[PDB]
Design a protein around this ligand. Structure first.
Ligand SMILES: *Cc1c(COP(=O)(O)O)cnc(C)c1O
Ligand SMILES: *Cc1c(COP(=O)(O)O)cnc(C)c1O
Lengths: 730, 730
């Protein structure tokens, strides 16, 4: 027991002697216990130690060992004979050796090395220049920071000259040791540890595979990181697949139909020989496994329906990663597709370990699963893939940030790991029942009825393993998703999503009254609860085993409290203190209902959710005036100008239009501004200039303050400036 | 005093009452003190409090205030009349208000906000998914990690849904607030906080300015990050400038001559019109301000000699940043070039804040100083420069890592900051004197004689402000640098460098006996001291105000101890325990002198340092067979094969050859393997296969295990594979 303590029951106490460490009772969560020591009859302690699925060695003290039943013997490690004092020293050695092996076995390779390295108190003259955080504590501000985070995070901040922790770049020693454990845990062929966010992780993927002018099959929901890297950077040629959207504006998956061999090819107008010739016209297809709004794909049906058309497939799964550890979710896992022939695509998975797994912000993994085509000329080897990695991977990775990727792997590994997640479904499934039965107006976006009974009337333990309760059925009265098919999509259970009053189910039109989600997000924040995101008529909360019932019931106290107030038409001053404070003029003497109604009508009258649909509907994509790689260059060269929003229609944008919702590009670079877009943006822009303290987050557009109102402006192609620029012509 | 304590003298104790906080004597370093309280006659305490240049408010308790001299009054903030009890409460209020303002004034904007945000205990449902590190503590390995780094580093790990700390991407609120303070502190026009290492910082710079086929003036010493981003990535065309090297193999600056307008242009053979036409044929010139081995440029003579030939200039100053804060070093600072006309180049500075400043690994800044040409078509605005920023900046920066860039700015700011650095010159200058006077065989790479007397016989305080003692004179008996000129280059004082026995000064040839620096690096590490790097006959130690005399004398204890043993020909077992252990066979019965001599002869007989020169000498650059952007594409497309080292001469490399020393590319991508290179690498390769436990670090080359020896192999162009690949031809 180096750091680990020892859990003993009061009776067992007097009978063991590894009194070198910290002993403590059992009502423990057993997470800092290296050995458990109890009396044989104290069977519930042996059971508690057991269920955790942790593997803590249990020692049962007896006075009649021959009497312990086989069954209990299947739960313990060693027996301690209380009536024998000659064994007192071997007893202590056994316990100590046990604790030490327990620990030596739970810690991942890199973390264990780093931890031991720091235990040496080496005199560092290498870089970081802060060396031990000792530069920091010499200055008063440096000292506040040093005492704020603590001496350790600095002590363990090391670099390349600390060879005992290996080489993280070309992967050697503990650095690669840990990456290989990640592989074993995730069922991949190589895991690359990325410390620059899945943003830079994608940059590695695309920049390794895609060559200039190569055909990229594009999921239209893709994060800016894919657009820019695969298309604008690598110079690939996208061939988009339209997306399902709905009255709530929710980001859905790809149109069931868009998955047609025949269609895709025609749809591959782009390079007729590339397409109308090849077995696989696409170098890569990049698809969003799980979207921000809870739609998870059946990785199994995609690889089958489009694998032959692409050399590799990148599943950008930043919003997931855990579906491989939740039984009912196995179909969604692409790394659990064990039967890949030489004919199907090398599969690749990019996941932000910080988002919904255990990791510090900026930590992600790249799982490489492509041995099935290891022969091929299309096959991208490690030398090539590590070349890319090294284009974006810093020459000086933050070490404590690497150990986080390492401890997350062991945390997902084993039944204990998969037990942690199950327990979360039980909590989550209960918080939702509580909200629903409690009468909340904010309702979990889940199937109303399932198996004749209603969703909240199911056995939670059944719902925690029964996918029937988490699936978007083909033809949904409730989800509104139009172009989906069977056993194609499911609802991500760790995306606690709630919808707000304002949108009608059956009818799919708006209602007369609606409670903009923003009013709710703000209320929450004002009461010490930070929501992840809140669109127009929905608010989202991100789940991981960190959740505890108290915390779930903490969110619900506030959700019921905000409702009590909206129905009682309280004063807008009271419900949203701060917004009223700042915008006291504009919101003078308002009631929440005043605002709710007002905001509500804006989008209602503005026919909002109609525009959000077309934006991702193929019969409404903008018009590619310039290829993405091209539009960039023009931008880089300064051949552009700032057309105002209103008269920018049909102008070629040199940057993507990134509004919220949904926060994906709406006009890719090189695409010429569409009538749709322009209008959606105008609803937003005017919404900004009408509801101060409620303005939607936009990107790729700039707001010039035009007297009373502010005004959007975008960087557009200027063929004239370009035209007359003698730097390029000849 | 929120966290800040209070330093009072025993006499002053009984006279003040802000007994709400922690009070403590004065023998303080004053770094956790918000107010200092003493008796008027205790003048040395008021002085100690003063010299720190911290700005701590001093309160002087008196019994005859009319008697305190003017001079002392210029040192105190407020007077405390001990003989007045009615003022007891206003006295306490004053002290408390004082401490609170002191603090509110020392903390940078972002740190202060993050710190206050965490003080609220908000219930986080946003991402990171670990939310508070509470996911981690639920698992035994997660718990070891959670207890290892502590609760705070996790608590303050936030994202976008935590709006109160602003928007770090598009820069708003506390995030931009801090970035602007960095600008004020650094004298730039915009500072961009980069959390992906100067590696990604460079990717931002080049990727914003350089357009495809643009002309890049290339410092041949440039880090892989520049080669790859400006050339291999942006597809720029380099025009190299040869580099000064020496018998120690040390990375020097650019050849004084290479800086000739006429030469540069001819030298610009590349695109005759681009050159033999334009005022500025170059879009960018990327130059290494300060190299790994101590040579710092005079930023003032560069901009003057080559500014007109380029639109912008990127000074990759990752090995520096502090020369702007050291008086004698101002010439080297580019941001302290205040007189920039519309005619001269927008100046940009990239610095790794973690390297030799105060920051966590992966932290760097990009200083944008280009307002002087803000009119121009060549002028790269923020919208364009933030576009690049956002290509590599993660959509989820690690926040604690951002506050590090923030506290580093305040730490450099003010006389207190510039006082911290000076003090370091005084320690460092004294450690070297000690080594030299003590008779060490490892000698600081400094001018032997200066001002008639010898270097270690100067007034240290004079040497800490006198550049004469840190400069490579034109024609040096001692530095061996050949192509340098006057007041062109200086020796970086915060790069504690020592050379080893083995190379002859006067003669510039090897000696008969030599002590490979690796022997020393290894000894050191074996005794709890981590050197930053150790080449063939030199070992480097990186300095910052974190150094303390005890630590300096700690290194020296070990340096004298290793010497005592080398002269006494100890057993190789004893001097290098571990190396002997592992390689017990090979080094059996060895004495250190046996190895020293052996290793020594290897490079001697191998004429090593001659090859290292030509490698950066223009009349010995490889032959560009393929432009860098091209060679990559071919690599990406798989048109390649693994030619072994020995028969790889004159083959086109698809990856740079990265040996150590010096750790810069020796064969850029597309360049065909040169005779020089091949040999240099063969010295290394054979050295690996001869001195196990002493193998040089290589990259871009692979070692296939050929029976007894291992073998280097590089990715070379394969025009045939290429030739027959029907995917590209038409
Ligand atoms: C978060 C996100 C990214 C961007 O990566 P970071 O890890 O946040 O730096 C890329 N793809 C998807 C689907 C994402 O949600
Ligand atoms: C360190 C270095 C880099 C690489 O940047 P990191 O900060 O280490 O990620 C780029 N340029 C130079 C001159 C460097 O020394």
């Amino acid at each position: 027991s180096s750091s680990l303590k020892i859990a003993s029951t009061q009776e067992a106490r007097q009978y063991f002697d590894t009194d070198r460490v910290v002993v403590d009772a059992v009502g423990s969560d057993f997470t800092d216990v290296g050995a458990v020591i109890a009396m044989d009859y104290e069977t519930d302690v042996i059971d508690a130690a057991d269920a955790t699925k942790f593997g803590i060695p249990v020692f049962a003290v007896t006075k009649d060992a021959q009497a312990i039943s086989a069954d209990e013997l299947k739960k313990i490690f060693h027996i301690i004979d209380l009536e024998n004092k000659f064994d007192a020293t071997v007893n202590a050695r056994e316990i100590e050796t046990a604790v030490n092996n327990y620990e030596d076995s739970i810690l991942p390779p890199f973390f264990k090395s780093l931890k031991e390295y720091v235990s040496r108190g080496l005199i560092q003259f290498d870089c970081p220049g802060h060396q031990g955080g000792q530069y920091y504590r010499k200055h008063p501000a440096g000292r506040e920071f040093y005492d704020f985070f603590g001496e350790t995070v600095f002590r363990a901040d090391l670099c390349n000259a600390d060879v005992a922790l290996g080489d993280l770049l070309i992967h050697e020693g503990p650095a690669v040791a840990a990456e290989k454990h990640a592989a074993r845990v995730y069922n991949a062929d190589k895991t690359y540890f990325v410390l620059g966010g899945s943003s830079n992780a994608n940059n590695t993927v695309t920049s390794a595979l895609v060559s200039n002018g190569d055909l990229v099959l594009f999921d239209r929901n893709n994060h800016k990181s894919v657009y820019n890297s695969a298309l604008a950077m690598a110079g690939g040629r996208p061939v988009y697949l339209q997306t399902n959207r709905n009255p709530y504006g929710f980001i859905g998956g790809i149109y069931d139909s868009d998955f047609d061999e025949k269609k895709i090819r025609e749809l591959a107008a782009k390079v007729d020989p590339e397409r109308a010739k090849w077995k696989r016209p696409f170098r890569l297809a990049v698809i969003q496994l799980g979207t921000y709004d809870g739609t998870i794909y059946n990785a199994h049906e995609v690889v089958k329906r489009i694998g032959h058309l692409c050399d590799y497939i990148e599943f950008d799964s930043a919003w997931v990663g855990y579906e491989q550890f939740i039984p009912m979710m196995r179909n969604s896992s692409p790394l659990l597709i064990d039967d890949l022939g030489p004919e199907d695509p090398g599969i690749i998975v990019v996941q932000s370990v910080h988002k919904q797994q255990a990791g510090f912000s900026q930590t992600s993994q790249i799982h490489k699963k492509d041995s099935h085509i290891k022969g091929q000329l299309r096959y991208c080897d490690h030398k090539h893939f590590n070349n890319s990695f090294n284009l974006f991977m810093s020459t000086s990775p933050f070490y404590p940030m690497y150990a986080a990727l390492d401890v997350n792997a062991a945390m997902q590994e084993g039944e204990a790991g998969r037990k942690l997640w199950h327990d979360l479904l039980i909590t989550t499934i209960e918080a939702r029942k509580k909200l629903i039965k409690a009468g909340s107006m904010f309702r979990p976006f889940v199937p109303p009825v399932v198996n004749g009974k209603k969703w909240e009337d199911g056995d939670t333990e059944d719902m925690a393993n029964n996918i029937d309760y988490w699936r978007f059925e083909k033809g949904a009265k409730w989800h509104a998703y139009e172009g989906y098919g069977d056993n194609q999509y499911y609802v991500d259970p760790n995306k606690f999503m709630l919808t707000t009053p304002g949108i009608n189910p059956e009818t799919g039109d708006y209602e007369d009254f609606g409670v903009p989600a923003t009013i709710v997000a703000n209320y929450l924040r004002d009461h010490g609860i930070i929501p992840e995101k809140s669109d127009l008529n929905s608010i989202l909360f991100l789940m991981t085993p960190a959740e505890t019932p108290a915390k779930m019931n903490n969110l619900i106290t506030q959700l019921l409290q905000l409702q009590r107030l909206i129905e009682e038409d309280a004063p807008l001053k009271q419900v949203l203190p701060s917004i009223y404070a700042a915008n006291e003029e504009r919101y003078n003497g308002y009631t929440i209902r005043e605002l709710c109604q007002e905001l509500h009508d804006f989008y209602k009258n503005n026919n909002t959710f109609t525009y959000q649909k077309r934006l991702f509907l193929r019969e409404f994509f903008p018009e590619q005036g310039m290829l993405p790689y091209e539009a960039r260059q023009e931008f880089i060269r300064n051949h552009n100008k700032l057309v105002p929003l209103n008269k920018i229609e049909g102008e070629i944008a040199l940057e993507g239009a990134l509004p919220y919702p949904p926060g994906v590009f709406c006009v890719a670079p090189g695409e010429k501004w569409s009538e749709t877009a322009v209008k959606y943006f105008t609803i937003l822009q005017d919404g900004i200039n009408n509801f101060p303290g409620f303005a939607p987050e936009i990107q790729g557009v700039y707001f010039k303050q035009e007297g009373d109102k502010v005004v959007a402006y975008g960087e557009v192609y200027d063929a004239e400036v370009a035209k007359n620029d003698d730097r390029y012509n000849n």
